[PDB]
Amino acid sequence: MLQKREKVLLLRTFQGRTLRIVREHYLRPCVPCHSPLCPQPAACSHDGKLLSSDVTHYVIPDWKVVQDYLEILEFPELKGIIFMQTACQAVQHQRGRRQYNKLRNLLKDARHDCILFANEFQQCCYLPRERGESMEKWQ
């Protein structure tokens, strides 16, 4: 079933000590997609907050459009938003705790069309870094 992979990290402590901590990662076959046109209900069963298809389109910030422009994406006229967990992780590890707390309230709310997606826990959307890179380009 699951597929193990690794993630190295370079943590810098307050005393100036960095370390190559290594950690884990477990992929899965079926990440729920919380959509009303998922062509197989059972495999995930969509047990959460679920959109209703009326919109013309769907807009997904890549990472920055929710990092700073978040204050826009609250108007209850905006419809059809889905958040990729990698953007959430970027903003959490880059914008402290306040913006992230507003974002998580946004998500945990039955007034808007916000869901969250496990980009990084899905078996063919994950991609490993390569020779010569950066967080922006990989992102």
Q: Which residues bind to RNA, rule: CB under 7 A?
A: 11, 13-14, 19, 21, 95-98
Tokens in use for 100?
């992230």
Helix (H, G, I), strand (E, B) or coil at 115: strand
Nearest-5° Cα angle at 59, 81 to 56: 90
We find the least distance from the C-beta atom of residue 12 to RNA, in angstroms, to be 9
Cβ distance to RNA smaller for residue 11 or 124 = 11
We find the least distance from the C-beta atom of residue 19 to RNA, in angstroms, to be 6
Cβ distance to RNA smaller for residue 57 or 97 = 97
Q: Are 45 and 21 in contact (CB under 8 A)?
A: no
Cβ distance to RNA smaller for residue 29 or 96 = 96
Nearest-5° Cα angle at 71, 75 to 125: 95
Cβ distance to RNA smaller for residue 66 or 115 = 66
We find the least distance from the C-beta atom of residue 100 to RNA, in angstroms, to be 8
Q: Name which of 99, 106, 98, 56 is nearest 76 in CA terms.
A: 106
Cβ distance to RNA smaller for residue 11 or 110 = 11
We find the least distance from the C-beta atom of residue 69 to RNA, in angstroms, to be 16
Cα dihedral 65, 71, 75, 80 sign: positive
3-state secondary structure 20-32: EEEEEEEEECCCC
We find the least distance from the C-beta atom of residue 96 to RNA, in angstroms, to be 3
